[PDB]
Amino acid sequence: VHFHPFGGVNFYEMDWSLKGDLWAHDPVIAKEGSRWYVFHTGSGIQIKTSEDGVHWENMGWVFPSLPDWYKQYVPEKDEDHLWAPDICFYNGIYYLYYSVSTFGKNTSVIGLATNQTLDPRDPDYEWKDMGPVIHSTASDNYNAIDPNVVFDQEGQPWLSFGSFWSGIQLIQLDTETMKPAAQAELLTIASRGEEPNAIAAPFIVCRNGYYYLFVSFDFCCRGIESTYKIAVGRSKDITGPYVDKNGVSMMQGGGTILDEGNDRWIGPGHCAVYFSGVSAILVNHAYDALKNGEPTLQIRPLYWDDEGWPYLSV
Numbered sequence: 001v002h003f004h005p006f007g008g009v010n011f012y013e014m015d016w017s018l019k020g021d022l023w024a025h026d027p028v029i030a031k032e033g034s035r036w037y038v039f040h041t042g043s044g045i046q047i048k049t050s051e052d053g054v055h056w057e058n059m060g061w062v063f064p065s066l067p068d069w070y071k072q073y074v075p076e077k078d079e080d081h082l083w084a085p086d087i088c089f090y091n092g093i094y095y096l097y098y099s100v101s102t103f104g105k106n107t108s109v110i111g112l113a114t115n116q117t118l119d120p121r122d123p124d125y126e127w128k129d130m131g132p133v134i135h136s137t138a139s140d141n142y143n144a145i146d147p148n149v150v151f152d153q154e155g156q157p158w159l160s161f162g163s164f165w166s167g168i169q170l171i172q173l174d175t176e177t178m179k180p181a182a183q184a185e186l187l188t189i190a191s192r193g194e195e196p197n198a199i200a201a202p203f204i205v206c207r208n209g210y211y212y213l214f215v216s217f218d219f220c221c222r223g224i225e226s227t228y229k230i231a232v233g234r235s236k237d238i239t240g241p242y243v244d245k246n247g248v249s250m251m252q253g254g255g256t257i258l259d260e261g262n263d264r265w266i267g268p269g270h271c272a273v274y275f276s277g278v279s280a281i282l283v284n285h286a287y288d289a290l291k292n293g294e295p296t297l298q299i300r301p302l303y304w305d306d307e308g309w310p311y312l313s314v
C-alpha cells in the first residue's frame with residue numbers, strides 16, 4: 001500500500017507481544033525509516049513511537065491545543081481531546097485526519113493536519129493545521145467523526161467515516177486538496193439497521209480486487225462494560241455494496257465478526273489494517289479487565305483464507 005508503506009518487513013515473522021506505554025484508544029500506525037508511530041485519541045492527538053514495534057513509548061502530541069475554528073462546529077470543549085486520528089502518506093506529505101466532537105452528539109467536524117515527516121528530530125517536522133474537511137450539525141443524519149482514507153486501485157482517494165445516526169459514510173476526495181469537492185456526493189455504505197445504530201470506526205483496505213470494510217459494532221467507552229466487536233464485509237467496488245460471508249448487506253446489519261473479545265480483553269474495537277508483502281496486521285484497542293478496563297493498544301498478525309476472508313491467528 002503506497003499510502004501505508006512499511007518497507008521490507010514481514011509482519012508474520014514479528015513479535016507482537018507489546019511492552020512499554022500501551023494506553024491507547026482508537027489507534028492507527030505508520031512507519032517511516034526505522035521508526036514506528038502510533039496516533040490515537042487524546043489531548044491534541046497522542047503519539048507513541050517505537051524502534052521495533054514491540055516496545056512503545058509516548059512521544060508527545062500533534063497539536064499543543066485546539067485550533068480556533070473548532071468552535072464553529074462544536075460548543076466550547078473544556079476537553080482538549082481530539083478523536084480517532086487516521087494517517088496516510090501521499091506525495092511526500094503525511095496526512096493526519098482526526099475528529100473534533102462531544103460525546104453523544106453529532107455536532108462534529110473532521111480536521112486535517114499535515115507534516116513533511118513523522119520524526120521530530122528532522123528539521124522539516126511541523127504539524128500544520130490545514131483546517132476542517134467535512135462536518136455534521138444536529139440537523140444532519142450522519143456523524144462526522146472516525147475518518148479513514150483509502151486510495152482505490154485507480155489511485156482515487158476516498159474518505160470513509162461515521163458513527164451512529166445513519167451509519168458509515170463515503171465520499172470522494174480531490175488529490176490536490178485531499179478534501180472532498182464542494183459538490184461530491186455523500187454515500188451511506190453501512191448500517192446496523194437498528195436504533196441506535198451502533199456501527200462506527202470504518203477502515204477500508206483493498207486486497208486482490210476486493211475492498212474490505214472493517215467497522216466496529218456496538219459500544220466503546222464503558223471500561224469493562226464495553227461491547228465493541230470488530231466486523232468485516234467486502235465489495236468488488238469501493239462504493240459497494242459491501243456484504244459479509246453470508247451474503248448479507250452491511251447496510252442491513254451484515255458483517256462477519258473478526259473478534260468479539262473475551263473476559264480478559266474486553267470489547268476490542270476501532271481497528272486499522274496494514275499490509276507488507278503477503279503479511280498483514282490488525283491494530284485496535286481493547287479494555288483491560290485486569291487493569292480497571294483501561295484501553296490498551298493491541299497489534300496482531302492478520303491472515304487470510306483461501307476464500308479471501310481475513311482472520312486473526314490463534
Ligand SMILES: OC[C@@H]1O[C@@H](OC[C@@H]2O[C@@H](OC[C@@H]3O[C@H](O)[C@H](O)[C@H]3O)[C@H](O)[C@H]2O)[C@H](O)[C@H]1O
Nearest residue numbers: 041083084103104105143163164165196200201
Ligand atoms: O473516543 C472514542 C469515540 O467514541 C466513539 O463513539 C462514541 C460516541 O457515541 C456515539 O453516539 C452514541 C449515541 O447514539 C445515539 O446516536 C445518541 O444520540 C448518541 O448519544 C457518538 O457517535 C460518539 O461520540 C467513536 O467511534 C470514537 O471516535
Ligand SMILES: [Ca+2]
Nearest residue numbers: 084146147201
Ligand atoms: Ca479509525
